[PDB]
Amino acid sequence: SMKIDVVTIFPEYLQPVRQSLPGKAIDAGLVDVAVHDLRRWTHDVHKSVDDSPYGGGPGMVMKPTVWGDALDEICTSETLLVVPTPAGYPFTQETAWQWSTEDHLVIACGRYEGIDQRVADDAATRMRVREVSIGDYVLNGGEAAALVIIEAVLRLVPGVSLLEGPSYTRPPSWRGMDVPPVLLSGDHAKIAAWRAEQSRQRTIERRPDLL
Amino acid sequence: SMKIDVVTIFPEYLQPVGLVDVAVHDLRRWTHDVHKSVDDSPYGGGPGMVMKPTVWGDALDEICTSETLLVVPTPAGYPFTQETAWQWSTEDHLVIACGRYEGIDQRVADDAATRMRVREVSIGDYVLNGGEAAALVIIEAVLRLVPGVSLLEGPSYTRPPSWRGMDVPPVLLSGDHAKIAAWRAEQSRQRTIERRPDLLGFDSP
Ligand SMILES: COc1cc(COC(=O)c2cn[nH]c2)cc(-c2cccnc2)c1
Ligand SMILES: COc1cc(COC(=O)c2cn[nH]c2)cc(-c2cccnc2)c1
């Protein structure tokens, strides 16, 4: 059973996740994903979520007073607070496996230049906090990263190396290209060895970093 | 200016998407029979189903041209990075083919590559149920680089200068750009070493 809370200034962006949830998983109480508009915790009539950076520079920084109030209300001592950021530790399949057993994830979606660092540092004095990157590219905000994280974790919750090689299905011949005959051979030891070699060759060509 | 076509059996997942136009297409629109079957069991055995080449071939025939960059997200792909985003930001036409089940028949990409440029790419070393979330990541990373639209970044701070008894580092309040530039450098180097030693050419933990 897992609760996921997402905090964002674009709550509609998280409409897809709540759709893709099977009804049976929700009714068996195995999962609950809730999305919260950050501006609910703003203090001023202009609903400000950001301000200029100390020390100057580009972009605005999200306000600690607003985030602090939000996390105070949503988090508990048992919460795993997830903060997507290009500056984070790498989020990998290992990470997804580990988090799939958590009772409560809270994902803080940041925008612009980032979130005042005191938010995470304060939170870390009473809960577990993980700043993570889903990849070495830059996005405008953490919302797309939240979708990726939610999907990678929840598909490892029951009910909710080398690269893989090519897959084939019917028909045996299509636009002049035949399925590799070994796959139709009924020699399953040989098929396994062909697939292993396919995997080795693909990994050398595409991901030599994994060797 | 850029056109992006996304092809998927779950088009409503792409809802959270005039310098660019983005169109989303239901792959089932190119099936011929009632059940609208898009997948079948893998030749050679294995787990899960494989998307059939026939449906994909018909969809891509209509949607792509020889100028098209066909993008296929897959955990088995070349890495999609910021360099990739820069490269694709000047393309006229991206088509993103979103797979489901355990994958797409390899002949779809192989056939496409006889007519156009094809890129199988991974957005990271984790596994998703389908390419749709990866498509959203790729679209965001690329569109923000479209004309008219290393080391890890260190910590950022804004007002107030003291919050819950936690002070903004004093150098950031000093107005000394040289001391500030140097402090930020030491922060970034320190963060990179700790979190991403691979970026500086060191062994991963
Ligand atoms: C909370 O701090 C953030 C968060 C994000 C969104 O996450 C990603 O882009 C990401 C997550 N894994 N890989 C990339 C982006 C920025 C940002 C944007 C532009 C310039 N500088 C910083 C800052
Ligand atoms: C077209 O072939 C695919 C595509 C995808 C979706 O993309 C990603 O998950 C992804 C993209 N970058 N990093 C990860 C997933 C699978 C798949 C799923 C489960 C088991 N095995 C394979 C296959």
A39: phi then psi, degrees, rounded to nearest 5: -70, -10
Whether chain B has a CB inside 8 Å of the CB on A148: the answer is: yes
Q: Specify whether the CB–CB gap between B125 and B75 falls below 8 A.
A: yes
Q: Which helix (H) or strand (E) holds A21?
A: none
Specify whether B10 is located in the same domain as B102: yes
Specify whether A200 is located in the same domain as A172: yes
Per-residue burial over A147-169, b if 16 or more Cβ lie within 10 Å, else e, is: bbbbbbbbbbbeebebbbbbbbb
CATH number at residue B20: 3.40.1280.10
Name beta bridge partners: B118: B70
Specify whether B116 is located in the same domain as B191: no
- Reduced 3-state DSSP string for chain B: CEEEEEEECCHHHHCCCCCEEEEEEEHHHHCCCCCCCCEECCCCCCCCCEECHHHHHHHHHHHCCCCCEEEEEEEEEEECCHHHHHHHCCCCEEEEECCCCCEECHHHHHHHCCCCEEEEEECCCCCCCCCHHHHHHHHHHHHCCCCCCCCCCCCCCCCCCEECCEECCHHHHCCCHHHHHHHHHHHHHHHHHHHCHHHHCCCCC
Q: At what angle do helices B132-143 and A143-154 cross, to 10 degrees?
A: 160
Percent of chain A that is helix, strand, coil (3-state, to 5) = 40, 25, 40
Between the CA of B156 and the centroid of ligand 2 the distance, in Å, is 35
Which residue, among A205, A194, A122, has the nearest Cα to A163 in the 3D structure? A205
Specify whether A46 is located in the same domain as A149: yes
Beta strands in chain A (DSSP E): 2-8, 31-37, 50-51, 61-62, 80-90, 104-108, 114-115, 128-133, 173-174, 177-178
| Resolution of the solved structure (Å) | 1.9
Count the Cβ atoms, other than its own, within 10 Å of residue A209: 9
Whether chain B has a CB inside 8 Å of the CB on A192: the answer is: no
Whether chain A has a CB inside 8 Å of the CB on B3: the answer is: no
Which residue, among B106, B97, B96, B110, has the nearest Cα to B42 in the 3D structure? B106
Query: Residue A200 corresponds to which tokens in the numbers above?
Result: 């080795």
**How far is B169 from A84, CA to CA, in rounded Å?**
23
A81 is in an annotated binding site: no
B23: phi then psi, degrees, rounded to nearest 5: -115, 140
Specify whether B181 is located in the same domain as B117: no
| Ligand 2 atom having least distance to the Cα of A152 | 9
Residue whose CA is at the smallest distance from ligand 2 atom 17: B102
**How far is B74 from B39, CA to CA, in rounded Å?**
17
Specify whether B134 is located in the same domain as B185: no
Query: Residue B32 corresponds to which tokens in the numbers above?
Result: 């011929």
DSSP-derived letter for residue A91 is: P
Count the Cβ atoms, other than its own, within 10 Å of residue A122: 21
Residue A195 Ramachandran class (φ > 0 left, ψ -120 to 50 alpha, else beta): alpha
**How far is B105 from B110, CA to CA, in rounded Å?**
9
Query: Residue B174 corresponds to which tokens in the numbers above?
Result: 């000093």
**How far is A37 from A5, CA to CA, in rounded Å?**
11
Which residue, among B158, B107, B125, B129, has the nearest Cα to A162 in the 3D structure? B125
Residues 6+ apart with CB under 8 A from A64: A115, A116, A118, A119, A122, B158, B163
Cα dihedral: B110, B111, B117, B121 (round 10): -40
Last residue of a domain, one of A120, A145, A160: A160
**How far is A102 from A25, CA to CA, in rounded Å?**
16
- Reduced 3-state DSSP string for A111-154: ECCEECHHHHHHHCCCCEEEEEECCCCCCCECHHHHHHHHHHHH
Specify whether A156 is located in the same domain as A78: yes
Domain count, chain A: 2
**What is the span of the domain harbouring residue A149?**
1-160
Residues 6+ apart with CB under 8 A from B137: A134, A135, A137, A139, A144, A145, A148, B80, B123
Specify whether B90 is located in the same domain as B158: no
Q: Specify whether the CB–CB gap between B84 and B132 falls below 8 A.
A: no
Query: Residue B132 corresponds to which tokens in the numbers above?
Result: 């749709």
Partner-chain residue, chosen from B13, B54, B137, that has the shortest CB–CB distance to A174: B54
Omega of the bond leading into A166 within 30 degrees of 0 (cis): no
**How far is A148 from A93, CA to CA, in rounded Å?**
11
Which residue, among A143, A173, A113, A38, has the nearest Cα to B184 in the 3D structure? A113
Residue whose CA is at the smallest distance from ligand 2 atom 4: B74
Residue type, B35: H
Which residue, among B55, B76, B49, B46, has the nearest Cα to B7 in the 3D structure? B55
For this PDB entry, the determination method is: X-ray
Specify whether B173 is located in the same domain as B196: yes
Count the Cβ atoms, other than its own, within 10 Å of residue A128: 13
Last residue of a domain, one of B149, B170, B185: B149
| Cα atoms in the Cβ-side hemisphere of radius 13 Å centred on B68 | 25
| Cα atoms in the Cβ-side hemisphere of radius 13 Å centred on B30 | 19
Name beta bridge partners: B131: none
Task: Please give the residue of chain B at the shortest CA–CA distance from A152.
Answer: B128
| Ligand 2 atom having least distance to the Cα of B126 | 14
**How far is A163 from A178, CA to CA, in rounded Å?**
23
Sort out which chain B residues have CB atoms less than 8 A from A113's CB and list them.
156
Specify whether B17 is located in the same domain as B84: yes
CATH number at residue B192: 1.10.1270.20
Name beta bridge partners: B5: B23, B95
Ligand nearest to the CA of A62: 1
Which position has the token pair 């994902």? A107
Cα dihedral: A13, A17, A18, A22 (round 10): 160
Specify whether A142 is located in the same domain as A66: yes
Specify whether A171 is located in the same domain as A84: no
**How far is A166 from A202, CA to CA, in rounded Å?**
9
Q: Specify whether the CB–CB gap between B72 and B120 falls below 8 A.
A: yes
**How far is B105 from B102, CA to CA, in rounded Å?**
10
Count the Cβ atoms, other than its own, within 10 Å of residue B41: 12
Query: Residue B75 corresponds to which tokens in the numbers above?
Result: 């955990």
Partner-chain residue, chosen from B10, B125, B140, that has the shortest CB–CB distance to A92: B125
Between the CA of A173 and the centroid of ligand 2 the distance, in Å, is 25
DSSP-derived letter for residue A30 is: S
- Reduced 3-state DSSP string for A69-80: HHHHHHCCCCCE
Which residue, among A15, A13, A4, has the nearest Cα to A157 in the 3D structure? A4
Q: Give me the numbers of helices (H) and strands (E) for chain A, helices first please.
A: 7, 10
**How far is B140 from B29, CA to CA, in rounded Å?**
26
Last residue of a domain, one of A140, A160, A180: A160
